[PDB]
Amino acid sequence: SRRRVVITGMGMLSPLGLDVPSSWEGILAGRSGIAPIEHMDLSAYSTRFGGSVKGFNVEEYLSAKEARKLDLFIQYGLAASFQAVRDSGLEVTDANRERIGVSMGSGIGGLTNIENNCRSLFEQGPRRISPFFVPGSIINMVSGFLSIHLGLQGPNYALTTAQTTGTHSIGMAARNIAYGEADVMVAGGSEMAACGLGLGGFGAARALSTRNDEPTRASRPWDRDRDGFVLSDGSGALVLEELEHARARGARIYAELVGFGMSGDAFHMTAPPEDGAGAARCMKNALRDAGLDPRQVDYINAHGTSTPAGDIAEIAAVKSVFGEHAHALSMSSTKSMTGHLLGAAGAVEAIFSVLALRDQVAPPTINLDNPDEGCDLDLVAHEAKPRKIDVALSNSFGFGGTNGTLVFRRFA
Amino acid sequence: SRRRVVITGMGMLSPLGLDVPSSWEGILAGRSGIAPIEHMDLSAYSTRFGGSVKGFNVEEYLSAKEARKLDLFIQYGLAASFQAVRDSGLEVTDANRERIGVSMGSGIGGLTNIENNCRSLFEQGPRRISPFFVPGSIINMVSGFLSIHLGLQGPNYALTTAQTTGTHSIGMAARNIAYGEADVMVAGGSEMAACGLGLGGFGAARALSTRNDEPTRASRPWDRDRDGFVLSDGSGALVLEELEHARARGARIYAELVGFGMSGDAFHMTAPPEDGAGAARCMKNALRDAGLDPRQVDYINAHGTSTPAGDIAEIAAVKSVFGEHAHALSMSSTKSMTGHLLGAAGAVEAIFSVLALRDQVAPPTINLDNPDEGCDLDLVAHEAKPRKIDVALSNSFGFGGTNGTLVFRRFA
Numbered sequence A, B: 001s002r003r004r005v006v007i008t009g010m011g012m013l014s015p016l017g018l019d020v021p022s023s024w025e026g027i028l029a030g031r032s033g034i035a036p037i038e039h040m041d042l043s044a045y046s047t048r049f050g051g052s053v054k055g056f057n058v059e060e061y062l063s064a065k066e067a068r069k070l071d072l073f074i075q076y077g078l079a080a081s082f083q084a085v086r087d088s089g090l091e092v093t094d095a096n097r098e099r100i101g102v103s104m105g106s107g108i109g110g111l112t113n114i115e116n117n118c119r120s121l122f123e124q125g126p127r128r129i130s131p132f133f134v135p136g137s138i139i140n141m142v143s144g145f146l147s148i149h150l151g152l153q154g155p156n157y158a159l160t161t162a163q164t165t166g167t168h169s170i171g172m173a174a175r176n177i178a179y180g181e182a183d184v185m186v187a188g189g190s191e192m193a194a195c196g197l198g199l200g201g202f203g204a205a206r207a208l209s210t211r212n213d214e215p216t217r218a219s220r221p222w223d224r225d226r227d228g229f230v231l232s233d234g235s236g237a238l239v240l241e242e243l244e245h246a247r248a249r250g251a252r253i254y255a256e257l258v259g260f261g262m263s264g265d266a267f268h269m270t271a272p273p274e275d276g277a278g279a280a281r282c283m284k285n286a287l288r289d290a291g292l293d294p295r296q297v298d299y300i301n302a303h304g305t306s307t308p309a310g311d312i313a314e315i316a317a318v319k320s321v322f323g324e325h326a327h328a329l330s331m332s333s334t335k336s337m338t339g340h341l342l343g344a345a346g347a348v349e350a351i352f353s354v355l356a357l358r359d360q361v362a363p364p365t366i367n368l369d370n371p372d373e374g375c376d377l378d379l380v381a382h383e384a385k386p387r388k389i390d391v392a393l394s395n396s397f398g399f400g401g402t403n404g405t406l407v408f409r410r411f412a
């Protein structure tokens, strides 16, 4: 019989701060983490701004010797994980290490390191490729390195489902616990795609906002004048724990994870369907999994990428799933402030949805100056909204028509 | 309590063949798929050979237009997937499309595409990066394209667990069906890394055999003269199906997937512990999941990569799990013939484990001329061994200490 799963620890790096509370204070103040990128010369690029992690000190977590071997996305995922585990108060023992696993994912993983080693190969030759090229760049090594540093011998894996990765990672980790394959999982995602290939690759697809003039105003989900997503870096990690296990050790419980939905659009490799049919199927799957009436949903943390087709598809999916109740819930895109952390987006947004439950506040959609046609829901324009939230939903949609929905509720 | 999961379709590209029966004929003949890599200047590389897919015709599967947009590893995964679905005879309908999903993964993903776009970026700047660079290179696009092409609306995701990916993808797909999240899944893995960054990256770590003078003898698991693994390309895919679903439509059933195990070594980034303690836990977990005693195992498809430390760790793990029955089971490494398909290794080896059951024959470990110290099990040296096989395991042990075991049984 299926066990209940609760959130006992959370950890983050985002464009708004180097931990959860600093990121969350920025979210509730309506602060933007988007700025011109300083780490490289981007005059040749149509987009020259993004959400960078500012002032990250990897030596808060790892020796300089080890850090040098690891792509930033792995450094970011370990930081978030180490925070989440510390925040949980869990002690790893011989009695429990086989029951604790990790599922930290990434959309693209070690693209900076792969580019750097590619430049070495092309300019010099294969003799100049780093010996750490593979273990320092491949996506499964957040889970790998985290298990090595903390002694976690439970299920050890990584998802890579593009912009859905962090939501899927958290959902399937919950399934592991629910079905008895583990008692604790560290789950979420990490991303640092801000290199020549990532900025150039998304730019070649004309997927990014090109508002270089006002980087902080570029991410404007459901605004009439949106022109694509803002590329952002960082990590989110959550400690998921079986309810009785958490109760038994006197753990602080943030919220319960009650529902998870997946669906494939089977529509298009990059475009969502205009009517959000895939998103609707996924949200209904998640609400049925949670045993809910759709009217119980109080807050939705939207995918809300600031893409013309993506944003309107989500309105359509929410109206389809919730009917008249769509006008009573609050829905916001924290990507208005953070930009789009890709494989990490679902991980930081899960955390923001849990904090919305803790603090009974809907985060704003900043930059929502002129809501587009049919975008007439409560999208929490401009300013945080204190309100009752018993049930919070976090949505992600990705390339390949992959959808994920997590349902969290307050724990009594 | 859980639904039963059977194999109804299989698909493959390997260094031995462009399908399952050609590959399996090569396996039972002890044929090698390893040869000097062509159409590439490997003068400056310490390893000049590997397991290429020979004569792949992508236009049997995709238009020229679609093929040009996708990395070889995505082409290979879709080829295996289409083969597997065709082999299953399954008919996708509006009635069943929400119950059919995909979990096709990769260890390292789009290195060829990343190389080619790096060349464009370094030589001409970012304006020459392909618009399709991102969707055409990310690991989840086998699941994505397959779901779009066949109209699959079930769970759509992709794992990336380095050399464990294929084993994990199949096991987790089996869980989706067992726990009623899907009735059908296409699962496995694909890889094309016997390319510049793959050979250069693994060669920098001195992980590869450098036996350039005798490429067919380089992969020699448990042989005293082994000097590292052989890099290989290809794909494997299985149609996994709920038993009553398969019976109702009169599907041909190859075997039953009865057990799945996962563990973490929590030991080292690339090397297993000398005693294979993590591999032991994983095999135990898989047998307990199947409700089977170690005495019931007849055949193990080893991970058996031809690394010094990895091969001996597996011997220690199997002696620990199976005690005196370790000498009565048969264990072989088909990597002696195929080399190491990394993320696809567990997919093609799951298929060889299924065909070991179908045909009642243990594939050989070729090149096992002088078994090393402690390597005194029935390693099916040199020649295929007809024998009774009721229960077959397939092991994968990957970077980050991530372990997977599948347990297959004859169906009746």
Ligand SMILES: CN(CC(=O)O)C(=O)c1ccc(F)cc1
Binding pocket: A131, A132, A134, A135, B201, B202, B204, B205, B206, B207, B269, B270, B271
């Ligand atoms: C180079 N090192 C570090 C070390 O020996 O200490 C590795 O572990 C290693 C890296 C990649 C690989 F394919 C195999 C091995």
